[PDB]
Symmetry: D3
């Protein structure tokens, strides 16, 4: 009966709520990253036979969380350029790296594209080839990835994904043709959440493209969203009624809002005001706290599609100006 | 509640219902095509500023039904070969030509891609720029395009679309770099039904790619599909109960099954056995009557997405073999 | 899920959001009507062979927008009196004039009933016989009537409907048995939106019955209504992201709230507090701006059905009191 | 999700499933009717102060099942002819007699109209004014379909059908009604009631039976998981020991069994996409209907059936009949 | 579409809306209870052939509203003790007493359990064996919420609540039952009934009231558009002239008005995402409740509430209470 | 929407479809169980202070798949008898062992009840305490447990669950009050499928109670079930369109139909004819191949609840007659 709505826009634009994060947030990520950096990155780019004619495609492997071997694609447009800018692409929920030809946009716009495959997913809308590896026993969980290892940040699924994602930018920077002054991190929804994390943790990203981000402002999310991936957390709490405080404590280490406050690189965001998967309150919480130079494209009538192909042109224009 | 099912695969493969067409079907089409040929084609290819680097994008204009000026895109991949193969791409229901960057797949595979905008639509999932023109009065209709002018094949919406589509192949052929002998016609859903009509009506098409085709086997479509575009016809009939014979007479001139019976060019079909928008029994009816060399890729667990990216690979492989 | 709610009643009674119209609102309508008044009304009544026994039914034809010939029914109850009061009845979305026996209420209560057919609709719940005529090209649109010609008030569908509707009152006035001092204009939903326009624009209407009106407070309507006809507008904007400003500019010329502010005749309104098709805030916006003498029947537990048969009795008592 | 469908039309036309009734079917209805006939009909027609002008409206009270007083409307078109034909009108599920102006069709077409109000319902889409009277009111699923279902003697439709038979007798007592030109009419529940009356009353000259409910219960519960028929299923989901008894009871009220007994001319209608009153259930009754018959088939309509188009067909059917 | 939400917890904790009851609320309940006290209780505990081994099961019958015979179960755990505490269990909407094995929790915790069957229901999720007995059964919407709603004297929950008060007396009459530790319990409709009993019974020692239904009817119909509260709204949708009567009738059965008068210790529970019994309705009742009281709040649960976590909470609550 | 239906009862009673299994089905299970038997069972029963007064409750730990430590409850009713019969209870999808008081039925009927916790689940409707331990990498999967490790039977999740279940009987049997001639294995839905496997694989089970069983006749299940856990398989196949043969090859090793053919102990089955989660054709396929002495209770009008409390009485009666 009731159509979805959130704070009106004048309120979203001022929405800077009290952040929740433990005092050891930076230390958790420092130690996480240091432990994973002990295993050699060992990036492998295997040229592959392909029907593509305008783009050269590579099969990628590199070491992410605790040396575990993560797949990707590297798509190189055939241009007369000794160096090229690069977009590192992160993938939406239940997706995976698919085929090289699923990622033609950035190469077609003259960018090398590094597509990071997502550990353990790749079965919902686009196939994937990378397994997850638990940090110990695989605890009781609700179906999906949002509650996997949620009783402890050290065991949580996104600790491993975010580490992979940081390592992904280092791997892309190792490709000789990549212009290390123009490496972009990009993503929509889950991709956007991952990218926000990478924007805070990476030593190599120079700009962020963050669309309709997921993994932002969890306590407000579960209040508004009864479908889709945020509802996995609620469903877990319905059964583990004694685990509320622990669950939100775990999630605080992974929250896009806490990452946005640490991020320094320039960013383009987008938000759909009728998006009931990633509510605009959650998106604006992150955007407003984002500490680098930033703009946001606001799509008042769109749901989780956001700006779609209009936003893609905005991203191209944004980056051309940033890097000219 | 009950999962969508159609006839079993064993039966689908032999499904060949009794066709129905009026005596003047070919004359209706000859006459329509001859009248539109009286206006100069006047194909215009104006290079526009996409931001594409691997492709050059032309804003296309050409004369379709009764000299009405139709929009499109022509995407040329950056390769030297003086005569390149070409895919003429027709668009799904409620879509339009969008941006040039929405159609990068065929260009990236080495093919010039001619994307035809769909008159009067372009407002549902991808934007469009081409108006429709009625013959005269815009008769009472149900919301949508399926019942626009349905009381007479002469006034019927798809008369105009299908004529535009045939003319589109002539426009693609006029581009200097297009190889006249390697022009493919392609589409999914509405695009599939248009391509199927064109496969019978054009003398310039060399091969057909027809995915999960719409506009096929109307009588059975409406018995199975209570949502999406086929339901428009049913809803018109629920009110205009006196018009059953007239409505189905009109639709017989635009039925993919009837065009398939006349089509002689090599084709690759795809079908999803759980497709409840374009039921496998309507697709198989068209496919089993298709008079040219033919194969069909069957996706037994997919809905209207059909083969998705797997099917695109199958199309590339199919055309490479055919052109050797 | 969340059950439908809008502003509470104490807030609804006081709701007068800031109006938006262009500086040429009045001139647009003066020139519209003056252009159509150049064509003779030519009201034509023809007695129908009917099975009806308590009513004389006539087929109606009259000149509406730019002389286009609009169908109607005139139902005269077989009574003593020399002159009778008259109800001009406008029809809901996807309806049409149907059969004479579809409109028995008002004749049975002793009122001549003029039923205006709705151009180009008549295919959803009750048949119609009147075509629409576009100005020129039929622009890209979303399925339905809400976005037909929406990029320009001069081309917008409701320009033609509202003009038809003003001309309908003249047509009714030309039946000699009609008491011109007691011409009422009535409708529900789309009918109520049409009637609201006519209450501002007609010189012959003596009273308004406006039930659960549609075409009111468009900005708020699209926030609250994601099903049904208001969401046609939203779906159009989701795709045509560059046209927001233009779309709402056009709709301002047709919004009941703006007409209500100009209307002087006595009116009875009705509203359902749980109506999620025509939200009570949109109805109250128009009611509260209505500048003639006015009452409103409020139905707290009804959805879009409103007061139904109870409300029909209320209208009978209201008009009787008004005219005594 | 799979879209609703039933048997194809070529099979629906040939669908004559094996009937099931108890051996005391006719005895049950004879005793029921005789028992209720022992109380006086005592029809009361009270002219109302109405806003209507083309129609004289009467508040009706008459004795139905076991002397119980049942409301109604009598609507009389203001015409010359001294004796007028009459349509007895029965109402859809969760409806009631509503207002006089809700029933203008038949008077407008020159027929006196008797609207029988429906005991205990009158709260879903149109209001009613007549209560039910049960005995103990056994455990039931919400609604009217399982009210007293463990015994035909206590079953809710025993009382409705008896009211409906008596309604025809009440209509025939009105002076301006031509007692030899009375018709029985109904849609959905109304159609199921009228089909009972077609078998049980000797007074009606014809049956108008649209998208009839209360037909072929066994089949109806296989196909209908929402709406009134599902009440029966839900009752059986819980009372897993009462299957035989529930269906035994329903056989006394099944339109298929009444159809087999009915001799008067009939115009039926069916929607081939009706998921409320499925076409297999309607055709089962239509195919056993023993009198002269025809069915208007609406292949794309759901439960609305032929709507106004069917109303026209009814006017022409009765016009030819009463010439 | 959108996720369910009510007032945030901070506001819920001080939500005390202005109560509405008629001047004669207490008088209405005294007459009701006195009229029913003129019939003998006549509790019958017939020992059953049961497969149970840790529990002795009785088939119960007692006199509820106006001497009408209400069914029940009594479950006695086999323990070395002569006087045992008791839980009088009331049942959720469309349920009934089912089998004795459906109610093993309280006996397994050492309590005698008196399960009261719910008149005229027992057909939706668990079978029942007890009929309702109304007079005329007025037009109503399908279900129990609008049965006899035009007069508190005829309203269905007059008879259920009287039954429920009388059930406590029947439990107390069982010789093993320790009369100083009689607890009244239920969830949803059960909790609504138990809350009435907490005001009307002189025999109850403690209240267990989970996710209570029958609370704050005005706001309930504003938030709840499916399930039992929506029966009222649908009745009102059609009976547009009866809004005032309907809500006047309802004020006599509203747990908010009972809570205001209840004195015995209570444990409530609430689901903050409960769209069937919204937390605003539950807290209105909790906040007005005049006895010593605690509430378990489950922020992420819907109508299931605390489920098995809550059962634990209850056992501890009563252990600490009776020690 | 079509109400759920399957084959009529006359057909269900004779439904014995052609079985599919690999030639190494027995060898796979023998090797699986032999490897897990190398680890000490080490069944731990800890008296666990509950408020239960008619029942003694024990916290249970035992070695399941590859020595992994599985939780459970042991509920012993306080009776005088020195030996008691035992029901080993397995749990439905997304459940876990919960609290001891969630399982009072069988103890109340004088049976010791051994409730096995379900590895990695315990988060949907009843909480669990036991983690899963993967066979190395956790492959790309669809959310849930149905496709966890589905590309190889050695890695498939239900390999570990079934092994655990077999060992559970060994654990229950080890308890001194348990009469080893009266060890029953029982479950509904997922529990019923687990029990079915255990009836073929346990050498200590004396009787099977098998209600509305899941994990049966996977091919047919996915043709009929589009929501709930069977649809996890379908969604995985929608994306992994090259894995169809491998997926079903893997599932044949865990299919209740194949275990049923090998099970010798007396069984009581139950089935709901309108069960759209575990369709009656899938259940009858298992029952019709079941090789021990067997009966089935058929509930024509029930959905997934089956016989509910009615069936629980049938079970008690069945076991009483069985054990003399």
């Amino acid at each position: 009966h009731m159509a979805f709505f959130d704070l009106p826009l004048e309120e979203l634009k001022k929405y800077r709520p009290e952040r929740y994060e433990e005092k050891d947030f930076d230390e958790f990520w420092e130690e996480t990253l240091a432990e994973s950096e002990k295993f050699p990155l060992d990036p492998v780019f295997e040229r592959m036979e392909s029907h593509l004619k305008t783009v050269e495609a590579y099969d990628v492997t590199f070491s992410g969380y605790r040396g575990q071997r993560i797949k990707g694609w590297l798509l190189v447009p055939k241009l007369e350029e000794e160096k090229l800018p690069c977009v590192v692409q992160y993938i939406g929920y239940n997706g995976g790296r698919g085929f090289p030809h699923d990622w033609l946009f950035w190469p077609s716009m003259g960018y090398i594209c590094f597509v990071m495959d997502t550990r353990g997913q790749g079965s919902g809308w686009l196939k994937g080839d990378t397994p997850d590896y638990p940090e110990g026993p695989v605890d009781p969980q609700y179906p999906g990835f949002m509650t996997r290892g949620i009783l402890d940040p050290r065991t949580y699924y996104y600790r491993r994904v975010f580490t992979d994602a940081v390592r992904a930018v280092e791997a892309a920077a190792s490709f000789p043709q990549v212009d290390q002054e123009r490496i972009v991190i990009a993503g929509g929804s889950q991709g956007g959440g991952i990218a926000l994390a990478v924007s805070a943790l990476s030593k190599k990203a120079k700009a962020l493209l963050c669309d309709v981000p997921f993994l932002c402002h969890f306590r407000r999310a579960v209040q508004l969203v009864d479908t889709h991936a945020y509802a996995e957390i609620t469903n877990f709490l319905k059964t583990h009624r004694d685990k509320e405080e622990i669950v939100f404590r775990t999630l605080s280490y992974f929250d896009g809002v806490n990452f946005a406050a640490r991020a320094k690189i320039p960013a383009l965001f987008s938000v759909g005001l009728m998006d009931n998967i990633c509510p605009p309150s959650t998106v604006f919480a992150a955007y407003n706290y984002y500490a680098g130079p930033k703009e946001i494209r606001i799509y008042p009538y769109n749901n989780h599609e956001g700006g779609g192909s209009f936003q893609a042109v905005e991203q191209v224009k944004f980056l051309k100006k940033l890097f000219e």
